[PDB]
Amino acid sequence: YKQMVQELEKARDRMEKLYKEMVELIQKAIELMRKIFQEVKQEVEKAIEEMKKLYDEAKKKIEQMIQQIKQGGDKQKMEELLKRAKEEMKKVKDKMEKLLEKLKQIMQEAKQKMEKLLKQLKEEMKKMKEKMEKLLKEMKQRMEEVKKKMDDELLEKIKKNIDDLKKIAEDLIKKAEENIKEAKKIAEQLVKRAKQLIEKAKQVAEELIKKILQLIEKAKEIAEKVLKG
Incomplete structure (x- = not known):
């Protein structure tokens, strides 16, 4: 029983590591x-x-065009400078x-990178699961060993320890799935915080075009004020 207790705690010691x-x-x-998000934020700023x-x-x-208006003279030169202004504005x-x-x-770019990360997380969690299940197979086999060789309370002292270190593995798998399903949360939160910055930049741009x-x-009114007299 000790040689089947030693190896089971070796196995459990393996699953905590996995x-x-x-x-x-x-x-x-x-x-x-987060470094992906900070790169995005630096670029938006x-x-x-x-x-x-x-x-x-x-x-x-x-403004200096408008000064050319204050000292300008001709209806012609006026519309020409107004022209230059709509031109420069369009450029901007x-x-x-x-x-x-x-x-x-x-x-x-940053969102599809975050989905790539989350997918990698998911698959490596699958790999992590199947490794633990192979471990459970090895336990079941060495138990079938200790059966087919020595030939009732021991048999059941090992078949209840093999069902415990399986419960262990299922809790650890659920812990890992809570982490994958929390990091996912952080990624979507960080995509929100950056869509806010794209929608703030759009606004600075719109308001600056409005000032222009x-x-x-x-x-224009000044050109007409000198046009008047």
Whole structure:
């Protein structure tokens, strides 16, 4: 009985190792997910810091155009400068349009990477399961050994220890499935936090284009104010 107690605790000592290696696996996969999110956030912020310099670049140009309006003269020259302003503004809107499209594809890049991680997690959890089940087979066989050789309370002291270290394996498998099904949660939460940043960048871009429009309108009324007299 001791030689079938020794080897069973060897087996159990094996399953706790299988488990904790699956859980180390999961937690590193999660750290990969967070560095993936931080890369995305860094990129969204920089794109914003570029939409801002786009606006300022456009606004210096347009304000000095408006100065050319204050000192301008001809209906002609007026419409020509208004022309230059709608032109410069269109440039800026196009550039932002590019930036945001960049942000959408980076978002998609990070989401499909997170689904790849989660799938890897799932399969390695399957591999981890079937290894434990092979272990259960080895236990069942060495028990059939200890049967076919020595020939009733021992038999049942081992057949109840083999059914315990199976219960062990099922709890450890359920623990691992709670981890896979929690890391999944963290990944979807981190995709939410980044869709918020894509929708904030869209908003900075829209509001900056709105300020530029107010500038062409100011300049328009001013062109008419000098047009009047």
